[PDB]
Design a protein around this ligand. Sequence first.
Ligand SMILES: CCCCCCCCCCC(CCCCCCCCCC)(CO[C@H]1O[C@@H](CO)[C@H](O[C@@H]2O[C@@H](CO)[C@H](O)[C@@H](O)[C@@H]2O)[C@@H](O)[C@@H]1O)CO[C@H]1O[C@@H](CO)[C@H](O[C@@H]2O[C@@H](CO)[C@H](O)[C@@H](O)[C@@H]2O)[C@@H](O)[C@H]1O
Ligand SMILES: CCCCCCCCCCC(CCCCCCCCCC)(CO[C@H]1O[C@@H](CO)[C@H](O[C@@H]2O[C@@H](CO)[C@H](O)[C@@H](O)[C@@H]2O)[C@@H](O)[C@@H]1O)CO[C@H]1O[C@@H](CO)[C@H](O[C@@H]2O[C@@H](CO)[C@H](O)[C@@H](O)[C@@H]2O)[C@@H](O)[C@H]1O
Length: 404
Amino acid sequence: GYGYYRTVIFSAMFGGYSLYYFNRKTFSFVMPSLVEEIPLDKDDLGFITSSQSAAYAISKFVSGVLSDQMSARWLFSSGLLLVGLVNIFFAWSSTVPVFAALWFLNGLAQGLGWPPCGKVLRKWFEPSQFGTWWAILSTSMNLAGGLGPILATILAQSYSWRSTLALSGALCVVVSFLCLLLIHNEPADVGLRNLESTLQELLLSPYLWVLSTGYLVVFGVKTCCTDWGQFFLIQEKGQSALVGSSYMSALEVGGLVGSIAAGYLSDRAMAKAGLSNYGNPRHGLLLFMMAGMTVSMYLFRVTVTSDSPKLWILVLGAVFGFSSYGPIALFGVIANESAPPNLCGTSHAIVGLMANVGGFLAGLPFSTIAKHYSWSTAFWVAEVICAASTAAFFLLRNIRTKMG
Ligand SMILES: CCCCCCCCCCC(CCCCCCCCCC)(CO[C@H]1O[C@@H](CO)[C@H](O[C@@H]2O[C@@H](CO)[C@H](O)[C@@H](O)[C@@H]2O)[C@@H](O)[C@@H]1O)CO[C@H]1O[C@@H](CO)[C@H](O[C@@H]2O[C@@H](CO)[C@H](O)[C@@H](O)[C@@H]2O)[C@@H](O)[C@H]1O
Ligand SMILES: CCCCCCCCCCC(CCCCCCCCCC)(CO[C@H]1O[C@@H](CO)[C@H](O[C@@H]2O[C@@H](CO)[C@H](O)[C@@H](O)[C@@H]2O)[C@@H](O)[C@@H]1O)CO[C@H]1O[C@@H](CO)[C@H](O[C@@H]2O[C@@H](CO)[C@H](O)[C@@H](O)[C@@H]2O)[C@@H](O)[C@H]1O
């Protein structure tokens, strides 16, 4: 009788996470029609966004460490209420400091979304199907971000800005009780069945640092290419400004399909596996996609000129997105799967912590080296770094897998 329970649990988690991500960018969704009532500038916008980003960055790690002990049913609902209440309070106030102080709590509550879902997925679904549903659930954020602007446009036309956030908060509070009532933390509670590791042992496993370095390199390269690619294409390749938007759209469209396909293929690879404590069945795609990333970077840098047509650029962007948005999901799955059953949350939190520094590296230093020599001089550096990391991961493949 696993079918009904799995269906209802996944539906509840999908709706809950869609609402969590929708109630995170609602400020940006309603921003246009908010300056006429309260006169602001770009500095206030930066202040609020920075406060939210810092709060989210801290809360992700804190929640990831905490969720290993507290229930994964009383977090996924408490965070959603808090988000809804903060949204309502934002709706019923109009001044910069209350906005800045409320959005900090918004981010702090937003940080409590994923770890409970990951824990429930690990302790409910099969070990050979844990990557497909992970990838499918990850697309709720994409769906919310792609459909939200349209709903905001058709809603704020017939109402005001304070008339939208109140409804969003009411919806969040209403659905919080449903997600609390429907989610079962473990299959043993109902009456079904499913199938000694200190934290120091987790911190004393080389595989964790290998995964951390891989995630750092992949995320840094992706951030660099998705940030300064338009500037490279508009100031060195002599292309029209129109091709940048198409290039980014192709990159995102390819990335979504890449994530889903990587999840499904890695899950399929596990069925035909001679389970052991050495190696990893998901390592084939964790290397093939990185090689594809390097090849696509080389082709984008070398064989692109004003003579090149639009189709070539679109294909290159799609291939780069397909090869770039997959290894991130695979790193997440591997870090949340190769850990002791009572320490899944901590390992994922430590791996994800290694991404803020990657973003910082992909930020100002890249602009500095571009300012000193050129854009191509920095893209070549990124290329060689990625190639060296791919090689190093290639030789270091049979390292011990099970942490602890
Ligand atoms: C108890 C703390 C203990 C640590 C102290 C060391 C320093 C701590 C600060 C580091 C940290 C929290 C640390 C988390 C917990 C650490 C626990 C580790 C324990 C190890 C055992 C906050 O770091 C900064 O975040 C910046 C906000 O961005 C702010 O700088 C201001 O903004 C600057 C430009 O951003 C300007 O220069 C200027 O406007 C300010 O300067 C700062 O106020 C804040 O300090 C990490 O924040 C990072 O989150 C990521 C989110 O992805 C952010 O990436 C981006 O964010 C958005 C734009 O940023 C984008 O929209 C988003 O697309 C992109 O992803 C990063 O940018 C950064 O935000
Ligand atoms: C099993 C899946 C179930 C179905 C759900 C998932 C599939 C739906 C995907 C929807 C999708 C694909 C667009 C092509 C559609 C064909 C796709 C084929 C499948 C569908 C048949 C829409 O992507 C665009 O959709 C547009 C609206 O249509 C938005 O325009 C807006 O509207 C204007 C006025 O309305 C306004 O001026 C203005 O607000 C916008 O300009 C764009 O903002 C949005 O990027 C992807 O959305 C998702 O992609 C990711 C990429 O990482 C993006 O997240 C990013 O993360 C950071 C870095 O990772 C980025 O730095 C950050 O910027 C971004 O947060 C977002 O894009 C996210 O939302």
